[PDB]
Design a protein around this ligand. Structure first.
Ligand SMILES: *[C@@H]1O[C@H](CO)[C@@H](O[C@@H]2O[C@H](CO)[C@@H](O[C@@H]3O[C@H](CO[C@H]4O[C@H](CO[C@H]5O[C@H](CO)[C@@H](O)[C@H](O)[C@@H]5O[C@H]5O[C@H](CO)[C@@H](O)[C@H](O)[C@@H]5O)[C@@H](O)[C@H](O[C@H]5O[C@H](CO)[C@@H](O)[C@H](O)[C@@H]5O)[C@@H]4O)[C@@H](O)[C@H](O[C@H]4O[C@H](CO)[C@@H](O)[C@H](O)[C@@H]4O[C@H]4O[C@H](CO)[C@@H](O)[C@H](O)[C@@H]4O[C@H]4O[C@H](CO)[C@@H](O)[C@H](O)[C@@H]4O)[C@@H]3O)[C@H](O)[C@H]2NC(C)=O)[C@H](O)[C@H]1NC(C)=O
Ligand SMILES: CCCCCCCC/C=C\CCCCCCCC(=O)O[C@@H](COC(=O)CCCCCCCCCCCCCCC)COP(=O)([O-])OCC[N+](C)(C)C
Ligand SMILES: *[C@@H]1O[C@H](CO)[C@@H](O)[C@H](O)[C@H]1NC(C)=O
Ligand SMILES: *[C@@H]1O[C@H](CO)[C@@H](O)[C@H](O)[C@H]1NC(C)=O
Lengths: 105, 73, 109, 100, 100
């Protein structure tokens, strides 16, 4: 889609994903953290470990990813690789392995 | 007798040895039957080869009965 | 090799007289040892169900051998303590086991 | 990565007699398949599943699922677990023929 | 080599983006047909409650951006391209035990 390419080129000209979105210095970003459990696999008691397959449900607002859909053929929503936007480092702290971050991006 | 055989690359028309006066054609669907179609084995046989639930055997005694389905005998 | 030992002992219980209350002890302990050996076999042998291996046939053979030995041991023990007050020896029992067989038993003494 | 309004997961189609038919099964080469030594495959369906409780916007409205109904080959256990225990319990029963 | 010219005229010249669905308008759907071939069934460990399988996913979809008139080029009837250059539907096993 040519409007999608144009819109992505626009949004991500000067957009840096290392930068936390604060339209005004001092603002806080509001992140909503939910969890969808898909399976409780194992609760091995010999090592005190708990294995789950879960979807995290994160939501936040990046003031930089805004646009008028009337200017882009009514595109009201985009699916963008996670590596291209700023995302908070929401991780499992109480892991027993060393895998803080998610698996499927 | 003259048969088509897949024992040569490309497929060639050859003269069977003594005892093999039959032209055969096995065809069965493998993992790629959707994209590539059925497998195709061709050649000469003395006794007509055995058939299995998934195989589909054509068997002749004439010359060049056994072309690849994209060809004419 | 352990299966060989167990099969030999299984055949061996039959030289033990019932006077010693140890025929069942011996046979059943051979059986217990063979069950523990089945336990190790399950750890050293493939757990596949495509076919019975040769070791598996041999193991089943020695187990059936031990068990048949135990059964016939019980029958022998009962034939031993078979009181006249309740059972009377028939004709075939004192004809085969007392008048024919002891005469064709050269390794007996 | 996309919702059902952006991509549509379907099953592959095929042809036999000039007609298109979907591949509603797992494909298994009948010659190159080495059967597992413990499990036999009875059925092998494939389904496209839609969850209408969910909305098409969203990644939970779609599913292509491949099912394996597999039967166990009961020989290792019959030869190493069931038969010996059955016969040993029969021994226990026969213990009643043993004089005190 | 005709392929060198073509694979340029498709990916670089025409500014092909692999992070964009192959749709002219962002209201059409990309139909992805996927089958499954079972190469071999490795295990069904009952203790870990995990099926281990070797499968071949067979995707099929249309990308209007990967089009060409074969006579304009030489009669190139087919092309092989690494999926790190073209748009790929990341269709994943959701009911996986490992993180795979
Ligand atoms: C363990 O498990 C294993 C897997 O599970 C299992 O493997 C199987 O073993 C058997 C036996 O070892 C294999 O069967 C053989 O397969 C061969 C390969 O078939 C492929 O290639 C031939 C073409 O062969 C030519 O080219 C190849 C490759 O370039 C060369 O390697 C060959 O030497 C030969 O080259 C000559 O010809 C070329 C021109 O073509 C020249 O350029 C070159 O200079 C040489 O002159 C194809 O025809 C085959 O296609 C057919 O089969 C495929 C599927 O396999 C089909 O899809 C296809 O449609 C065709 O039907 C295939 O692509 C065969 O060559 C070999 O054939 C001989 O044996 C069979 C019967 O056994 C005869 O019918 C046949 O006529 C051949 O007999 C000749 O050769 C044998 C020795 O090979 C002689 O003993 C015999 O006297 C006769 O001799 C004449 O020709 C010889 C040349 O072959 C020549 O040297 C002699 O001097 C003489 O003049 C046979 O079918 C099987 O493939 C294995 N399977 C797998 C998966 O690996 C293994 O057995 C298991 N083991 C145990 C213990 O369980
Ligand atoms: C079959 C073997 C039968 C056998 O030899 O039993 C014999 C040995 O009995 C034993 O010595 C115990 C069993 C050992 C046999 C060794 C395995 C042979 C294979 C029976 O022993 P016996 O007859 O009671 O002893 C007789 C003594 N006499 C030989 C001097 C008369
Ligand atoms: C998805 O569709 C439902 C039903 O129309 C709607 O309530 C919801 O807001 C939609 N979600 C988004 C992100 O547009
Ligand atoms: C492909 O190119 C040839 C060469 O100009 C032309 O004749 C033909 O019409 C073209 N086909 C299409 C479908 O554009």
């Amino acid at each position: 889609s040519v409007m999608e390419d144009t819109l992505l080129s626009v949004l991500f000209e000067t957009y840096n994903p290392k930068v936390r979105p604060a339209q005004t210095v001092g603002d806080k970003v509001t992140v909503r953290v939910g969890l969808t459990l898909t399976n409780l696999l194992i609760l091995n008691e010999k090592i005190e470990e708990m294995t789950t397959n879960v979807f995290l449900n994160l939501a936040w607002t990046d003031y930089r990813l805004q646009w008028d859909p009337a200017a882009y053929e009514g595109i009201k929503d985009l699916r963008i690789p996670s590596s291209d936007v700023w995302q908070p480092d929401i991780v499992l702290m109480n892991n027993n392995d060393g895998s803080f971050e998610i698996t499927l991006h | 007798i003259v048969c088509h055989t897949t024992a040569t690359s490309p497929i060639s028309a050859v003269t069977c040895p003594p005892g093999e006066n039959l032209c055969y054609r096995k065809m069965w669907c493998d993992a790629f039957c959707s994209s590539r179609g059925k497998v195709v084995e061709l050649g000469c046989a003395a006794t007509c080869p055995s058939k299995k639930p998934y195989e589909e055997v054509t068997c002749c005694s004439t010359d060049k009965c056994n072309p690849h389905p994209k060809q004419r005998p | 090799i352990p299966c060989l030992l167990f099969s030999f002992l299984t055949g061996l219980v039959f030289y033990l007289p019932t006077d010693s209350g140890e025929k069942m002890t011996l046979s059943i302990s051979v059986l217990l040892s063979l069950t523990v050996f089945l336990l190790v076999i399950v750890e050293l042998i493939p757990s596949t169900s495509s076919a019975v291996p040769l070791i598996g046939k041999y193991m089943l053979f020695t187990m059936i051998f031990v068990i048949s030995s135990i059964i016939i041991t019980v029958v022998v023990i009962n034939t031993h303590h078979r009181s006249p007050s309740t059972h009377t020896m028939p004709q075939w029992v004192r004809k085969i086991f007392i008048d024919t067989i002891p005469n064709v038993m050269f390794f007996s003494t | 990565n996309y919702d059902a309004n952006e991509i549509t997961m379907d099953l592959m189609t095929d042809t036999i007699d000039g007609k298109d038919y979907p591949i509603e099964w797992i494909i298994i080469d009948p010659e190159a398949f080495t059967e597992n030594g413990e499990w036999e495959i009875i059925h092998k369906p494939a389904k496209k599943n839609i969850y209408p409780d969910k909305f098409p916007n969203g990644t939970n409205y779609q599913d292509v699922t491949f099912y394996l109904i597999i039967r166990r080959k009961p020989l290792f256990y019959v030869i190493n677990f069931i038969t010996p225990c059955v016969l040993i319990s029969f021994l226990a029963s026969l213990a009643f023929y043993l004089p005190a | 080599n005709e392929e060198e010219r073509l694979i340029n005229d498709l990916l670089i010249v025409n500014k092909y983006n692999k992070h964009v669905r192959p749709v002219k308008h962002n209201n059409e759907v990309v139909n992805i047909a996927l089958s499954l071939t079972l190469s071999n069934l490795i295990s069904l460990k009952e203790t870990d409650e995990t099926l281990t399988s070797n499968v071949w996913m067979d995707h099929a979809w249309y990308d209007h951006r990967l089009t060409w008139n074969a006579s304009e080029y030489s009669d190139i009837s087919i092309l092989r391209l690494p999926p790190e250059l073209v748009w790929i539907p990341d269709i994943v096993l959701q009911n996986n035990n490992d993180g795979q």
